[PDB]
Amino acid sequence: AGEHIPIVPVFGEWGFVEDKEVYEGVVRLTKDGQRLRNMIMSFNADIV
């Protein structure tokens, strides 16, 4: 029924590399710190 695309995506932080959509949320960089925090935590659990 649409003569234009009925799918309009909302983006967070957004831009282009060159001729390619690139986007990221707020959780991208937290994957680095969170897994690291758990590694140190889980090792010291064994000592206890």
Partner 1 sequence: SAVSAVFHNLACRIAPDYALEATAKIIATAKYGKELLYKQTAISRAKRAPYPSRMPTGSGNSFPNLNEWHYFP
13 in Cβ contact with 22 (< 8 Å): no
At its nearest, how many Å lie between partner 1 and the CB of residue 17? 34
Task: Specify the residue, 24 or 38, whose C-beta has the smaller distance to partner 1.
Answer: 38
10 in Cβ contact with 25 (< 8 Å): no
Residue type, 10: V
Task: Specify the residue, 10 or 48, whose C-beta has the smaller distance to partner 1.
Answer: 48
26 in Cβ contact with 12 (< 8 Å): yes
Give the footprint of partner 1 on residues 4-43 (CB under 8 A): 38, 42
User: Which positions lie near partner 1, rule CB under 8 A?
Assistant: 38, 42, 46
